[PDB]
């Protein structure tokens, strides 16, 4: 809810990793996300009859779109939580056009934590999980706010 300015440079340094491949982390992220939580795909109807994790990895659309998240995602974290101007935008498509519950927010989390792990080893250890879990709970809880701030969502 308030990171140190401690965590969120560690939030920033494994960002820059992130940076380093975008496509290849965007399309780790939305590949795992869509094999650990499949409800997730069907509200993708430009993705929803991908189904073996061999097709998703094949398919330049899941990875160009990957990289949409992780930008919007990054420069949203490169605010440090003074982010409200970013996410509005974000918030307004994903709660009323794609409709998409906050719930489905924290599963992408955790697919962001799980490929940040496998795709950073030694980089990701427990401080820099600590830090970006923390970054992306208060990303979730400021979109849940602006949810309701559009009249949305239980
Ligand atoms: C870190 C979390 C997320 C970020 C930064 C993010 C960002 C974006 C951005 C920038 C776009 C393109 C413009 C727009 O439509 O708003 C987009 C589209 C979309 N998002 Fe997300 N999103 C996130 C989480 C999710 C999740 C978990 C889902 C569904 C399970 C989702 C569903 C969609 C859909 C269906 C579209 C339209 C896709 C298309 O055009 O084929 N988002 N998102």
């Known amino acids: 809810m308030v990171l140190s300015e401690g965590e969120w440079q560690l939030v920033l340094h494994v960002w820059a990793k992130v940076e380093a491949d975008v496509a290849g982390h965007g ?3 939305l590949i795992r996300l869509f094999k650990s939580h499949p409800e997730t795909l069907e509200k993708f109807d430009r993705f929803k009859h991908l189904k073996t994790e061999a097709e998703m990895k094949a398919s330049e659309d899941l990875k160009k779109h990957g ?3 992780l930008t919007a995602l990054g420069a ?3 605010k440090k939580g ?5 996410l509005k935008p974000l918030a307004q498509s994903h709660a009323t056009k794609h409709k998409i519950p906050i719930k489905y927010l924290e599963f992408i989390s955790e697919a962001i934590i799980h490929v940040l792990h496998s795709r950073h080893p030694g980089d990701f250890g427990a401080d820099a999980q600590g ?3 923390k970054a992306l709970e208060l990303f979730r809880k400021d979109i849940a706010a602006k949810y309701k701030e559009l ?4």
Do not use: S
């Open 27 to 29: 399309q780790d992220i």
């Open 67 to 69: 990289v949409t998240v």
């Open 76 to 78: 949203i974290l490169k």
């Open 82 to 86: 003074h982010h409200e101007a970013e």
């Open 131 to 133: 830090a970006m879990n």
């Open 151 to 154: 009249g949305y969502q239980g």
